[PDB]
A paper describes a structure:
Kinesins are a family of microtubule-based motors that play important roles in intracellular transport and cell division. Kinesin-1 transports cargo within cells, a process tightly coupled with ATP hydrolysis. Whereas kinesin-1 in solution is mostly loaded with ADP, ADP release is accelerated several thousand-fold upon microtubule binding. Here we characterized kinesin-1 P-loop mutations that interfere with ADP binding and determined the structure of the corresponding mutated nucleotide-free kinesins.
We also found that when T92 is mutated to a valine, the nucleotide content of this mutant was very low compared with that of wild-type kinesin. Together with the observation that the T92V fluorescence does not increase upon incubation with mant-ADP, these data indicate that T92V has lost most of the kinesin affinity for ADP. We first determined the 2.0 Å resolution structure of T92V in a P21 space group crystal form. There were two similar molecules in the asymmetric unit, with a root mean square deviation (r.m.s.d.) after superposition of 0.47 Å (305 Cαs compared). The main difference between T92V and wild-type ADP-kinesin is the missing nucleotide and magnesium ion in the T92V nucleotide binding cleft. Instead of the nucleotide, an electron density, well accounted for by a sulfate ion that likely comes from the crystallization solution, is located close to the missing ADP β phosphate. However, in apo-T92V, helix α4, which is C-terminal to L11, starts at residue D249 instead of residue K256 in ADP-kinesin-1, i.e. is two turns longer. Finally, whereas T92 interacts with D231 in wild-type ADP-kinesin-1, this hydrogen bond is not formed in the T92V mutant, as expected. Therefore, we conclude from these observations that the T92V mutation disables Mg2+ binding, which would normally stabilize the ADP association and limit its release, and leads to a nucleotide-free kinesin without the need of an overall structural change towards the tubulin-bound apo-kinesin conformation. Therefore, an ADP-kinesin-like conformation can be adopted both by nucleotide-free wild-type kinesin and by the T92V mutant.
Residue numbers in the entry: 7 to 238, 248 to 324
Write the structure that this text describes.
Amino acid sequence: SNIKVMCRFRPLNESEVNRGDKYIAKFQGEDTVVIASKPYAFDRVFQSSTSQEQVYNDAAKKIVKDVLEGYNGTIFAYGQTSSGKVHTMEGKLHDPEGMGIIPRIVQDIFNYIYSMDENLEFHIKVSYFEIYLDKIRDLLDVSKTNLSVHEDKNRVPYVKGATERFVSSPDEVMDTIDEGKSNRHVAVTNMNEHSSRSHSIFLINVKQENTQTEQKLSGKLYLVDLAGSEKVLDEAKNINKSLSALGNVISALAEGSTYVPYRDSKMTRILQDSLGGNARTTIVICCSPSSYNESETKSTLLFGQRAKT
């Protein structure tokens, strides 16, 4: 199994401080967090004061290199609502300090590409879509609202009709993310409720061709901001279904099973060529350190434990 799991704790938020919550996360070394005297070991644990830069460097940087070598990959943000998933995945998009994983990935991709000599030709294209109530919508074309999953020649599942946009700079990709977030408001009355109950999926497809040696390489990287994992409606059941499917896929891979139940959900089907097999995966579980959220945090930590070999 190629899955790594890293746990990120955010600082206590304003409500938590005012309410008088206790900081219940205890840290041991760089890989362990202990809750109520019970330890949970991961590939890495980030404490509340961990910077965006360091999170990227541990969770994502190496996967970006693999994608530039022709690997596929997935990076997930998992955790209850307000645990810091979007701050981690997106952060402040145009801010060199505040930017999250996706902007740093894109920068790294282009930094490598523009440094290469004339023998290499690159084509970078991005897609951005969401899954809500078990329906796929293109965030770059809001007329595309119930996209189906299809399989190509080589039995590779794909989203039929999803917008694929060619990009040639990090600024252009950020502009694409900005447009997607704005488009996401279409037909949505409450964004907080919607975003907490849907999964957002950003895809970067990096194709390269050395015209001198006549070699081609292609790498796909999916960046997934999952629905909130909290136990707190048709929305709930759909969300339970999609995360439980991902859970079973992760456990199957962690067991070294040859059979992996990708078909358990649309999402895992979509990610089939970039999750398991020879693809690289990091799950970043996000948690509140507040005593008030102790039950959901334990649940999040136990979800992360699934990837343990």
